[PDB]
Amino acid sequence: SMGEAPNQALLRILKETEFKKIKVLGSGAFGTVYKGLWIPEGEKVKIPVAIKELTSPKANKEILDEAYVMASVDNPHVCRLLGICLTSTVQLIMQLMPFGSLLDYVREHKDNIGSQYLLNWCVQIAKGMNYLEDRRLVHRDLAARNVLVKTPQHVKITDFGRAKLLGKVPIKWMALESILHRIYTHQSDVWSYGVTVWELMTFGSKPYDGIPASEISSILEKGERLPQPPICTIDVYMIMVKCWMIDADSRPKFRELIIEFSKMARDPQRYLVIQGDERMHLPEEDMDDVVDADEYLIP
Ligand SMILES: CC[C@H](C)Nc1cc(Nc2ccnc(-c3cnn(S(=O)(=O)C4CC4)c3)n2)ncc1C(=O)NCCC(F)F
Ligand SMILES: [Cl-]
């Protein structure tokens, strides 16, 4: 093989009759996502799924590139494609993530989220990202909105619509080299990881809230960064600031971020100061044959 190794991932094609749409979970620019059940025929098994749609030939091109990428990933902190359905609109059949986006989760449970959870989410995102780096894959769109929540203890990265091998763009999560020069490395995803961590530690604040995106390039060139969240010690903020260095190679590698955040995760109250940290706790069908996608494996 002249460069990359051959990608022997199986694209599984699912019948429309195998799965039942239940309700609409979300709708927007990204598309239409539905809650559903997948019942693979023969097997006494029911699999909670999210079904993503979007109509146009350019749109089928974009979602099949996303399907390509999700089909080729297998890590506990990255979402995989279960299959595709080839109806009039191409559907992506994915794992149901019951607690939704991590951005929406931190906003809704601001009063119940402890330091242990926040730091473990940072570990898990770093592991997910390091895996994508091992697969030579630049996400190009890491943010709290694109991290989903399987359980409060277990998050995964998704939205591979911008994912590429090493009009509208998410300026406020992007490294300076990406805004100025369209340069995207694993180290530009590290910048976005920093902003993602900032979202989590502020319980889902909008980064640069009020600033228009055309002004952001000059702001970052001047040396301005996102402010230190109230709960963050200097230890945690220094790691965020390190992700936002001008020099890309000077930023942390994802493997180092796993290490540092997991050290901090063993003594969470030393690194995040939250009022009342200790008392905080977190969590129609025949459910007998229900199996989560992580337990439904294929030969
Ligand atoms: C916020 C994302 C969407 C609307 N919500 C869900 C998505 C999923 N599954 C998966 C699995 C892998 N990838 C995706 C994926 C890919 N791209 N995107 S995206 O929408 O473009 C992205 C937000 C911009 C989502 N989704 N599971 C559950 C929910 C949900 O709403 N749970 C709350 C109620 C419960 F009853 F379900
Ligand atoms: Cl790949």
Domains of the chain: 16-96 (3.30.200.20), 102-271 (1.10.510.10)
**Which residues neighbour 68 within 8 Å (Cβ) at sequence distance 6 or greater?**
none
Task: Say which ligand is closest to the CA of 156.
Answer: 1
Minimum-distance ligand 1 atom for the alpha carbon of 50 = 9
State whether the beta carbon of 125 lies less than 6 angstroms from ligand 1.
Answer: no
Find the distance separating the first CA and the last CA of the chain, reported in whole Å. Answer: 25
Residue 243 near residue 251 (C-beta atoms within 8 A): yes
Whole-number Å distance between alpha carbons of 29 and 15: 26
Whole-number Å distance between alpha carbons of 262 and 129: 15
Distances (CA, A) of 88 to 93, 144, 216, 276: 15, 32, 41, 52
State whether the beta carbon of 73 lies less than 6 angstroms from ligand 1.
Answer: no
| Ligand 1 site-directed mutation target among 158, 173, 285, 294, most atoms within 8 Å of CB | 158
Residue 47 near residue 296 (C-beta atoms within 8 A): yes
Which amino acid, one-letter code, is at 281? H
Method: X-ray
Question: DSSP class of residue 253?
Answer: P
Please give all residues whose CB falls under 5 A of ion ligand 2, grouped by chain where several chains appear.
72
Whole-number Å distance between alpha carbons of 248 and 262: 23
**Resolution of the experimental model, in Å, one decimal:** 2.5
Answer yes or no: 141 catalytic.
yes
Tokens encoding 177? 């080299």
| Active-site residue, selected from the candidate residues 104, 111, 141, 159 | 141
* DSSP string of 184-222, one letter each residue: --HHHHHHHHHHHHHHHHTTSPPTTTT--HHHHHHHHHH
State whether the beta carbon of 293 lies less than 6 angstroms from ligand 1.
Answer: no
Which amino acid, one-letter code, is at 66? E
State whether the beta carbon of 101 lies less than 6 angstroms from ligand 1.
Answer: yes
Q: Nearest C-alpha to atom 29 of ligand 1 is from which residue?
A: 100
Tokens encoding 23? 């309700």
